[PDB]
Amino acid sequence: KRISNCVADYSVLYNSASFSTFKCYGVSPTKLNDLCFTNVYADSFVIRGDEVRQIAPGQTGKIADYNYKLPDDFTGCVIAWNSNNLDSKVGGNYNYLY
Amino acid sequence: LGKLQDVVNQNAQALNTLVKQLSSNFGAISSVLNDILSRLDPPEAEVQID
């Protein structure tokens, strides 16, 4: 997703009190709110519970090296939460690939 | 005049090189110190500022 010609605030995207984890390798939402950025990108995907650990700048594994490599100069934020009541179902949910 | 021109040209070129030195990252991810502060937290971006 590409964010361009749009004015907004990240305060709403933080006070939900429902995100299990929050890994912004860059700046605090407020820190990146006071200043003005040129462009913002959104990379959304699904992952298991034992692979959120590997999504960090400077880590190895089987997902962070074969699907999405995080560079050293990574200034983005990672927002992750549990929504297992919608993207999973009884009998085996195999619609997601890796 | 050669003697009177070298002492001015050398100083001007040294000042220009001093200006150019601020345009290099010195092995960091950015040149200006404000960009890393705006894009990264000060506890983590201490190495680049150092």
Swiss-Prot record, chain A:
Superkingdom classification of source: Viruses
Result when mutating S20F: In strain: Omicron/BA.1, Omicron/BA.2, Omicron/BA.2.12.1, Omicron/BA.2.75, Omicron/BA.4, Omicron/BA.5, Omicron/BQ.1.1, Omicron/XBB.1.5, Omicron/EG.5.1
Outcome when changing L97Q: In strain: Omicron/BA.2.12.1
Effect of L13I: In strain: Omicron/XBB.1.5, Omicron/EG.5.1
Positions of the UniProt region annotated as Immunodominant HLA epitope recognized by the CD8+: 93-98
UniProt effect for mutating S18P: In strain: Omicron/BA.1, Omicron/BA.2, Omicron/BA.2.12.1, Omicron/BA.2.75, Omicron/BA.4, Omicron/BA.5, Omicron/BQ.1.1, Omicron/XBB.1.5, Omicron/EG.5.1
Disulfide bonds: C24-C77
Consequence of substituting S16L: In strain: Omicron/BA.1
Effect of K62T: In strain: Gamma/P.1
Region of interest (Integrin-binding motif), residue spans: 48-50
Record's function text: Attaches the virion to the cell membrane by interacting with host receptor, initiating the infection. The major receptor is host ACE2. When S2/S2' has been cleaved, binding to the receptor triggers direct fusion at the cell membrane. When S2/S2' has not been cleaved, binding to the receptor results in internalization of the virus by endocytosis using host TFRC and GRM2 and leading to fusion of the virion membrane with the host endosomal membrane. Alternatively, may use NRP1/NRP2 and integrin as entry receptors.
Subunit and partners: Binds to host ACE2. RBD also interacts with the N-linked glycan on 'Asn-90' of ACE2. Cleavage of S generates a polybasic C-terminal sequence on S1 that binds to host Neuropilin-1 (NRP1) and Neuropilin-2 (NRP2) receptors. Interacts with host integrin alpha-5/beta-1 (ITGA5:ITGB1) and with ACE2 in complex with integrin alpha-5/beta-1 (ITGA5:ITGB1). May interact via cytoplasmic c-terminus with M protein. May interact (via N-terminus) with host bilirubin and biliverdin, thereby preventing antibody binding to the SARS-CoV-2 spike NTD via an allosteric mechanism.
Protein name: Spike protein S1
Natural source organism: Severe acute respiratory syndrome coronavirus 2
Gene: S
Curated annotation (Swiss-Prot), chain B:
Domain of life: Viruses
Coiled coil: 5-49
Known function: Subunit of the fusion protein that is processed upon entry into the host cell. Mediates fusion of the virion and cellular membranes by functioning as a class I viral fusion protein. Contains a viral fusion peptide that is unmasked after S2 cleavage. This cleavage can occur at the cell membrane by host TMPRSS2 or during endocytosis by host CSTL. In either case, this triggers an extensive and irreversible conformational change that leads to fusion of the viral envelope with the cellular cytoplasmic membrane, releasing viral genomic RNA into the host cell cytoplasm.
Name of the protein described by the UniProt record: Spike protein S2'
Organism: Severe acute respiratory syndrome coronavirus 2
Lineage of source species: Viruses, Riboviria, Orthornavirae, Pisuviricota, Pisoniviricetes
Full protein segment contained here: 945 to 994 of 1273
